Design a protein around this ligand. Structure first.
Ligand code: SF4
Ligand code: SF4
Ligand code: SF4
Ligand code: SF4
Ligand code: SF4
Ligand code: SF4
Ligand code: SF4
Ligand code: SF4
Ligand code: SF4
Ligand code: SF4
Ligand code: SF4
Ligand code: SF4
Ligand code: SF4
Lengths: 183, 174, 571, 183
């Protein structure tokens, strides 16, 4: 058992250039005929982290990979599973029951149409046209692929991958040193 | 309401035992020797398909001689009065009715058994109501894939799923 | 009314079966709730294979061909004709005048009697069975591990969750109860890796599908081994304690990479990484393989690689794990423990060594030849070259199942003397010279040796139709007519006791009392009070070899167009 | 396209008074001669949402209106369609094949006899009496009629109609405001 790492953003230096979302889209859809260039993407854009801008600046929010995850436990079908250290939703068994949106307080899960092989996925018996398949999208730490593309795509490198052992140890060491430097 | 039988494709090897048992039980009883449970091959999975006993049938509404009728808790063909007007074969959504013809058998182990062993009418799963034991298909299966669902098992399953959903929603987050 | 315990003869698994008989005729079949293999449920052939024994066309009398037409003739003068024919051919051209085709669907006593009455009566090493077409498997496993048969025991694959690795998946329609255990193994923890070029009913339930074209599974397993070596999942204690080396295999496995097999076979890269991880991190792994891999020309190095993959991981000689060869007939293993090959003797002894010959002189009877006999693939050449005079087609029809049928049919026009101790509906008997009725599985009292080397007994329930009689008395009559020292086959019990006496090192405690009490025993069992070896076979150590240490063989991809772009396969 | 809204219950304020099923039954059976008064009801009562109780509280549940609805895919006749913003069942093409009961994990569908014009409907050719016709029943969000009637009948206002897109925006804003006030 190991604590799940989670990427976090820095609102102090973040600009809101939206250059990390597009990299996430490009890295997730490698099987949908993408050649790292514009004009080869005939499918709409689907990101995983979402940017929110308010009077106190702009910041991207994403899945925190909750240890006591409510999204996995509310899911009755069992689409959300903890395959690795991070938490990842499975698109094969998901049916679109929006109870996940009733669970996650941060709100990093979006219900969006599926896209495979450069085409939109159709269904059997729905309405007289057919209806798109809606699936759950959230960050999966890019554990299936290599190093996550959101890192080293920010111009000032605002977002960082942190796992809470080293941060806690550094904070405790700094607090102890500050306490000892005064006494 | 009506009792029927369902087979989850997770534990079906396609071993042709249920099909042969369904054929031979009906043969030794004195009815048509043809099976009433069809094995279908698809792109993803193999599942036997039989007559899910429709509570409105779409079958007795098209029979001109009034051969198909509801008896006990099942839909019964009443083979004696059937004439062969292939009308119920049009109105069955799942395709659970086949006709007693030698060419209707696909090439498999069962065909070899029935040719080394040795009227045309519509045959349908009658749920083996003439036998004091349960259905033969659910009883001879090596992996117990098939299972018989009653009027009360549906209610029990519905209540179980509903209670599990409510308890999970209560326990995790309101 | 009356229930008789019997082992189902249709495939090699072996199952308990109550032959519900009534008015001397079979009326039903029932499963055994206390059997450890089938657990009280059978496939199609068990439930409806009893309608084969009382057909109206069953052969009920001996017939002989006098002028081209068969005539109903009593037993004694037919035996006279057989005896004088064998005597004259032996006087003319010696003892190499016949090749013995013992059935793979007969009890072990039939094969033993056939071997003895072809070796201790006339004397030749010309014995064969039509189940050789798994022949490289026994050769490869013996050269790798020193074991010539199954290693683990079937019911252990479902007692607890393991990792099941299938090669050439056809188990779902060749052994409909072993795959029943594999499916029942999925106690929410059994995990499947399947590799085959086709679509079956078993791959659709598999979490991971290693769909690889035919003949390209040696690079697949080599890349699998490369991945499990690069990640350091090798059990170093097992290889440093019992194996002879590691770098020799490394010198031949590093040439294959995941990208190499990616561009060679056309399979995704993450599947191999995943499957290697699931095989490595798990402590239990069983390698099944069906008929598909065994019908390949280059299966020798392939099964060597299959054994060595389990060697390098350490999932051998432990309960719930081990390599699993599968046999396609009930008594294939009964054709290896006793001699049914031209270079083997009962007890897994080779006739090429004089030590295996000098151990039996008077306990066996007449002196034995010391030369290697004629193989099943070579005797058609002798038929065409007119170097053999007779042939014994026993209990089988080797004109349809065996490949290249037309060559054998054209070879069959060598009518001097032919004995077919068989049953109805065989074209070989129509093309034969002398036909004699035989007895089926429910008419005999013998033993079955399954794929899992378990030994069970067959109990007679129905009486024979007409003058059809078991082959033991036929062989005894022939030997007495030619002249045999003593007289054998008082009953089957004496024959089985003689089998126990001749080879006590392998099995000497397999008697009728234990098989009546226990649910079958599996050899080795050198004494009576032993409970048998299995899920170990003999390996607890990989030291079934005479050198007490296993070796390795380096592998390489072999060679096979526009005229025939489609590959043809069969099962 | 827009995500289908679904009504949800708040278990902390529900009592179990069963005043929500009665309103739904009254509002869907206007063709059965009901005049908002007990005594004009000549039909057995059939609601759409179903109330159950456990040790940790009582609530009703109903159809969640899944986007990739399993109940629509299982039905081979095609009676279940998405007619409007919600997903509805059609009482004219239903044949009674209970396989839709084996699809919905929430169990919001019940097979019950159809009632029209104050009398039970009877099938034409079945057995010597006439068998009734059985139709599925589930929540259809009252699309043909006005606002949902389960809401505005609950005394404690435990029932709420949620929009699964605006709620995510509200959660995102609350999370951003909570995080920015600390940093
Ligand atoms: S929307 Fe998908 S992931 Fe979320 S609860 Fe429903 S099935 Fe599970
Ligand atoms: S989806 Fe939401 S609730 Fe689930 S782990 Fe991620 S942040 Fe936590
Ligand atoms: S870790 Fe991967 S999936 Fe998650 S936000 Fe970054 S790029 Fe997207
Ligand atoms: S790329 Fe960097 S600056 Fe731009 S929105 Fe993302 S985190 Fe902010
Ligand atoms: S008996 Fe069971 S496993 Fe065999 S074909 Fe029928 S459903 Fe499939
Ligand atoms: S085939 Fe038989 S059951 Fe079908 S409609 Fe005609 S008479 Fe009725
Ligand atoms: S035959 Fe088909 S349509 Fe008729 S009752 Fe059976 S499943 Fe329904
Ligand atoms: S219930 Fe009886 S008639 Fe129907 S499929 Fe099974 S064995 Fe055949
Ligand atoms: S698995 Fe083999 S031995 Fe067992 S019942 Fe079937 S055919 Fe007979
Ligand atoms: S009962 Fe009605 S809604 Fe359900 S599957 Fe059958 S036709 Fe469709
Ligand atoms: S009936 Fe059940 S499965 Fe169908 S949309 Fe409603 S909640 Fe989903
Ligand atoms: S929204 Fe309408 S149909 Fe759904 S439960 Fe409420 S009153 Fe009934
Ligand atoms: S009307 Fe409101 S308080 Fe009463 S049972 Fe229904 S949901 Fe609960």
């Amino acid at each position: 058992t190991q604590l799940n790492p989670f990427v976090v953003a820095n609102p102090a230096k973040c600009i809101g250039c939206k250059a990390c979302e597009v990299a996430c889209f490009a890295v997730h859809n490698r099987n949908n005929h993408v050649g790292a260039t514009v004009g080869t993407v005939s499918i709409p854009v689907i990101p995983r982290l979402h940017l929110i801008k308010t009077e106190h600046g702009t910041m991207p929010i994403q899945c925190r990979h909750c240890e006591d995850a409510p999204c996995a436990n509310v899911c009755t079908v069992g689409a959300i599973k903890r395959e690795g250290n991070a938490i990842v939703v499975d698109e094969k068994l998901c049916i679109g029951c929006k109870s996940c949106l009733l669970a996650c307080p941060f709100g990093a899960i979006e219900l969006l149409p599926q896209y495979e092989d450069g085409r939109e996925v159709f269904q059997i018996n729905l309405k007289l046209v057919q209806e798109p398949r809606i699936i759950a999208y959230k960050c999966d730490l890019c554990n299936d692929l290599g190093e996550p593309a959101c890192v080293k795509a920010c111009p000032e490198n605002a977002l960082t991958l942190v796992m809470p052992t080293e941060m806690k140890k550094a904070r405790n060491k700094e607090a102890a040193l500050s306490f000892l430097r005064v006494v | 309401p009506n009792r029927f039988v369902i087979a989850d494709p997770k534990r079906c090897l396609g071993c042709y035992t249920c099909i042969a048992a369904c054929a031979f039980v009906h043969e030794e009883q004195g009815l048509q020797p043809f099976p009433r449970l069809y094995l279908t091959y698809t792109s993803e999975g193999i599942m036997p398909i039989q007559c899910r006993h429709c509570e409105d049938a779409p079958c007795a509404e098209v029979c001109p001689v009034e051969a198909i009728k509801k008896e006990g808790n099942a839909i019964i063909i009443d083979e004696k009065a059937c004439i062969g007007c292939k009308t119920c074969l049009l109105a069955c959504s799942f395709g659970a009715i086949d006709f007693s013809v030698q060419d209707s058998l696909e090439q498999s182990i069962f065909k070899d058994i029935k040719e080394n062993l040795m009227r045309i009418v519509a045959v349908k799963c009658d749920l083996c109501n003439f036998r004091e034991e349960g259905p033969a298909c659910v009883q001879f299966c090596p992996t117990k894939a098939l299972k018989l669902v009653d009027g009360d098992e549906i209610n029990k399953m519905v209540k179980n799923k509903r209670t599990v959903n409510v308890e999970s929603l209560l326990s995790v987050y309101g | 009314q009356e229930k008789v315990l019997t082992t189902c003869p249709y495939c090699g698994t072996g199952c308990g079966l109550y032959l519900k008989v009534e008015n001397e005729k079979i009326v039903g079949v029932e499963p055994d709730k206390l059997h450890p293999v089938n657990q009280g449920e059978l496939c199609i052939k068990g439930y409806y294979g009893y309608k084969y024994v009382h057909d109206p066309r069953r052969l009920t009398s001996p017939l002989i061909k006098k002028n081209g037409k068969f005539v109903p003739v009593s037993w004694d003068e037919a035996l006279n004709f057989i005896a004088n024919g064998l005597k004259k051919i032996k006087s003319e051209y010696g003892s190499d005048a016949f090749a013995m085709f013992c059935s793979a669907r007969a009890t072990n006593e039939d094969n033993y009697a056939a071997q003895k009455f072809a070796r201790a009566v006339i004397g030749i090493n010309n014995v064969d069975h039509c189940a050789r077409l798994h022949a490289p498997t026994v050769a490869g496993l013996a050269m790798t591990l020193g074991s010539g048969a199954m290693t683990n025991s079937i019911p252990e694959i479902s007692t607890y969750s393991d990792v099941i690795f299938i090669i050439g998946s056809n188990t779902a329609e060749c052994h409909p109860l072993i795959a029943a255990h594999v499916i029942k193994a999925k106690e929410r923890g059994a995990k499947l890796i399947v590799a085959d070029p086709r679509m079956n009913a078993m791959v659709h339930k598999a979490d991971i599908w290693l769909r690889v074209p035919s003949g390209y599974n040696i690079p697949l397993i080599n890349g699998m081994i490369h991945i499990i070596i690069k990640e350091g999942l090798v059990k170093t204690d097992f290889v440093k304690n019992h194996a002879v080396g590691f770098e020799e295999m490394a010198k031949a496995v590093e040439k294959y990479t995941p990208e190499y097999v990616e561009e060679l076979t056309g399979i995704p890269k993450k599947d191999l990484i995943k499957a290697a991880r699931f095989y490595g991190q798990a402590q239990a792994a069983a390698i099944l393989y069906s008929m598909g891999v065994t019908q390949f020309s280059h299966g020798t190095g392939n099964v060597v690689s299959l054994a060595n993959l389990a060697v390098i991981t350490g999932n051998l000689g432990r309960p719930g794990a081990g390599i699993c060869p599968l046999r396609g007939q009930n008594n294939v293993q009964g054709a290896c423990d006793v001699g049914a090959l031209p270079n083997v003797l009962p007890g897994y002894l080779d006739v090429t060594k004089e030590q295996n010959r000098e151990r039996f002189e008077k306990v066996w009877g007449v002196k034995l030849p010391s030369n290697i006999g004629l193989r099943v693939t070579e005797v058609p050449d002798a038929i065409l070259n007119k170097r053999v005079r007779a042939l014994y087609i026993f209990g089988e029809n080797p004109i349809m199942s065996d490949p290249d049928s037309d060559h054998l049919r054209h070879a069959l026009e060598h009518l001097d003397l032919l004995i077919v101790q068989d049953i109805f509906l065989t074209e070989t008997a129509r093309l034969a010279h002398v036909v004699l009725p035989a007895a089926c599985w429910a008419e005999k009292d013998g033993t079955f040796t399954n794929t899992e080397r378990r030994v069970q007994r067959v109990r007679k329930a129905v009486e024979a139709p007409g003058e059809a009689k078991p082959d033991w008395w036929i062989f005894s009559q022939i030997a007495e007519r030619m002249g045999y020292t003593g007289m054998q086959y008082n009953n089957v019990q004496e024959i089985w006791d003689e089998v126990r006496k001749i080879v006590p090192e392998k099995f000497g405690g397999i008697s009728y009392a234990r098989l009546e009490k226990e649910k079958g025993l599996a050899w080795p069992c050198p004494t009576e009070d032993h409970t048998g070896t299995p899920g170990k076979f003999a390996t607890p150590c990989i030291c079934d070899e005479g050198a007490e240490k296993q070796d390795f063989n380096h592998v390489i991809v072999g060679s096979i167009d526009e005229e025939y772009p489609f590959t043809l396969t069969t099962g």
